[PDB]
Amino acid sequence: MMTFADKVIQFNKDLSYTGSTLPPGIRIMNPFKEHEQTMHIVEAFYHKYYNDNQSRYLILGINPYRFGSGLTGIPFTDPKRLITECNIPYSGKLSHEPSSVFIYEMINAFGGAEAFYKQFYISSPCPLGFTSIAANGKEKNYNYYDSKALEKAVYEFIIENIRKQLTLGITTDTCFCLGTGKNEKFLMKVNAQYKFFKRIVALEHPRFIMQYKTASKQFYIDKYISAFKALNNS
């Protein structure tokens, strides 16, 4: 349990859903129990970028989805970005995640994966995802906040996960929240209750940027980087 990487690896290895019964039709989606390749990628990634005992600033997404980074276990890192940006091999079907494209263009504008991950650690309030399958067979992914019943079912599980992420060695002055909608409302209410962080800075979620601000992706790159700079300036 020595390094930051060791702790993340043990966390993901041990992660299991301990919340309440989910709404009808919804199944827990645990990327680390789905396919045997995932933990190997986890080990490869964190030992590459977190092989130290330095603290990190926390960036919080929403929660994993089955596609893209859900096949790697690495936040915002789909198979193509894992191969091309992290130089870590991936066997099997590629899975395109728009958020991963944005995040790694931002990371390169920042100075590269090594420099960024030396300073930042990405997680999410809810470390698991959720899926349902419709009568036609199409599969739906959920955000933890998509209904009052789902959020109620997973609330303490989420709080315990955030507390657990803080035990990794997190500089708590600023947490960055990706998602200016319901994710922000949830994390502001949580932080007012528990005071995990001195302040929360919310940024548009990479998926929102890719889908609705596509022509302006560069501006949002700058926005992310100016927020990280303001933290380091001050």
How long, in residues, is the chain?
234
Is residue 234 within 8 A of residue 122, CB to CB? The reply is no
Q: Say if strands 129-133 and 27-29 run parallel, antiparallel, or are unpaired.
A: antiparallel
Q: Report the DSSP pairing between strands 129-133 and 139-141.
A: antiparallel
Centre a 10 Å sphere on the Cβ of residue 127 and count the other Cβ atoms it contains.
Answer: 22
| Way it was determined | X-ray
> What letter would DSSP give residue 22?
P
Give the amino acid at 3. T
Is residue 45 a contact partner of residue 99, using CB atoms and an 8 Å limit?
no
Which residues, 6+ apart, have CB-to-CB distance to 176 below 8 Å? Answer: 57, 58, 59, 60, 200, 201, 202, 203, 227, 228
Find out whether 16 and 30 touch, Cβ atoms under 8 Å. Answer: yes
CA distance 4 to 46: 8
Record the resolution, in angstroms.
2.2
Contact 176, 58 (CB under 8 A): yes
Sign, Cα dihedral of 106, 112, 114, 119: negative
| Euclidean distance between CA atoms 186 and 125, whole angstroms | 9
Return the number of other C-beta atoms located less than 10 Å from residue 46's C-beta. 23
**DSSP, res 165:** H
DSSP string, 167-226: TTTEEEEEEEEE-TTHHHHHHHHHHHHH--SSEEEEE--HHHHHHHSGGGHHHHHHHHHH
CA distances from 60 to 40, 93, 160 (A): 23, 27, 15
Q: Which two tokens stand for residue 36?
A: 């045997």
Contact 99, 63 (CB under 8 A): no
For the chain, the distance separating the N- and C-terminal CA atoms, rounded to the nearest angstrom, is 32
